[PDB]
């Protein structure tokens, strides 16, 4: 299978500097072109560079050029993305692609992508707290910044019955909630914990569903 | 740059039926490529050069046209096709991709299973009362909520967050969350949550 991993997504000021990491493997990473694609928060797509096999050749849309340089390492199969001069509208999840010998020019291979933030707000680790009265459970996830977080229940095994509520952002935070929907006889009889990871703030947090 | 205009915004159909969304070009494509997006994942490739279907995408679906229009077709709709279209060429530099069509599916009216729930203890102690209300699987998707503390309607503080529609019963959800203080909330005892497409209504008491 090919696989695409982006990292070094993240939080960064207006006028700053961030730097994107691809790692590619399942294909001879050094006969493909690459390109990243960004997807805002309008949930608009642009391509925003593209490279060669051996890194010669590079190209970018007017709104980026100057600010980001797209390179590549043949060795560690890693592509990268250096954003300079970043403005507000670089707010976007960043993809890495990979195309086609084939020509034609779709994208062939998507990453699960990396958000990049550009704002002057801090980063701040959510508090989490249990929402206790089939029955439904939540988890409460306030004041976090910036995006994203992951909120599973009992390792993934009730994921079924989850629904995951967009983060609204309020006084410079965000805060979003997610639900679980269990059988009566399921909870309270079992425990039932919701596991909010915040990869900005290299936090996770537990918190055991019990009726108040 | 080629312009992608695609059709309609939205495309709402039910289950069983034939629909066709449309992706026009400002000037001539030789190929035109497509990608199915579902909320919380990557476009995924769905149709490659005009007509093929990339591994794993249904028969149902097809792709034709040529020039400057091209269109993705579904012969009989499921609810699993809930999702962003999004059409996207590259026969000129640079590439460019359509705003995309949504396709939501019709079903049966369903009520909200409505859950209200009290600030955790931590909460209040740190001087917070967020009281949040689930509407959970609902259809349509227009749905009102409105909040009442000791019977009287609250509108300050009421912030609504809605899902996209469940590519497997077809539903949406939506959650309303009451940001009171900790100080505010305790001048009061009876919460509720409301919600109409006669109502569904929720309740607590502080007190209990
Ligand atoms: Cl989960």
């Known amino acids: 299978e090919v696989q695409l991993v982006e990292s070094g997504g993240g939080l960064v000021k207006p006028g700053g500097s961030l730097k994107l990491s691809c790692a590619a493997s399942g294909f001879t990473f050094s006969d493909y072109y690459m390109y990243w694609v960004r997807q805002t928060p309008e949930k608009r797509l642009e391509w925003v560079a593209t490279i060669n096999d051996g890194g010669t050749y590079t190209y970018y849309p007017d709104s980026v050029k100057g600010r980001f340089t797209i390179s590549r390492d043949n060795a560690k199969n890693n592509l990268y993305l250096q954003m300079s001069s970043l403005k507000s509208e670089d707010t976007a999840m960043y993809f890495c692609?990979?195309?086609?010998?084939?020509?034609?020019?779709?994208?062939?291979?998507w990453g699960q992508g990396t958000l990049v933030t550009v704002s002057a707000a801090k980063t701040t680790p959510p508090s989490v707290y249990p929402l206790a009265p089939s029955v439904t459970l939540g988890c409460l996830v306030k004041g976090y910044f910036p995006e994203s977080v992951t909120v599973t229940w009992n390792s993934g095994s009730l994921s079924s019955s989850v629904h995951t509520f967009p983060a609204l952002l309020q006084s410079g935070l965000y805060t979003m909630s997610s639900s679980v929907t269990v059988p009566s006889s399921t909870w309270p009889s079992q425990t039932v914990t919701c596991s909010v990871a915040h990869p900005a703030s290299s936090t996770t947090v537990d918190k055991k569903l019990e009726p108040s | 740059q080629i312009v992608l205009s695609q059709s309609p915004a939205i495309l709402s159909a039910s289950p069983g039926e034939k629909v066709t969304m449309t992706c026009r070009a400002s000037?001539?494509?030789?190929?035109m490529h497509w990608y199915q997006q579902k909320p919380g994942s990557s476009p995924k490739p769905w149709i490659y050069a005009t007509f093929n279907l990339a591994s794993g995408v249904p028969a149902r679906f097809s792709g034709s046209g040529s020039g400057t229009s091209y269109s993705l077709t579904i012969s009989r709709v499921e609810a699993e096709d809930a999702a962003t279209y999004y059409c996207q060429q590259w026969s000129s530099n640079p590439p460019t991709f359509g705003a995309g069509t949504k396709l939501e599916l019709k079903r049966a009216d369903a009520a909200p299973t409505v859950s209200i729930f009290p600030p955790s203890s931590e909460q209040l102690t740190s001087g917070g009362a967020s009281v949040v209300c689930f509407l959970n699987n609902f259809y349509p998707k227009d749905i009102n909520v409105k909040w009442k503390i000791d019977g009287s309607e609250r509108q300050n503080g009421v912030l609504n967050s809605w899902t996209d529609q469940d590519s497997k019963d077809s539903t949406y959800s939506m959650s309303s969350t009451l940001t009171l203080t900790k100080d505010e909330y305790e001048r009061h005892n009876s919460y509720t949550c409301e919600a109409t497409h006669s109502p569904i209504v929720k309740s607590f008491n502080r007190n209990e």
């Open positions: 000037s001539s494509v030789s190929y």
């Open positions: 692609a990979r195309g086609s010998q084939l020509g034609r020019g779709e994208f062939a291979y």
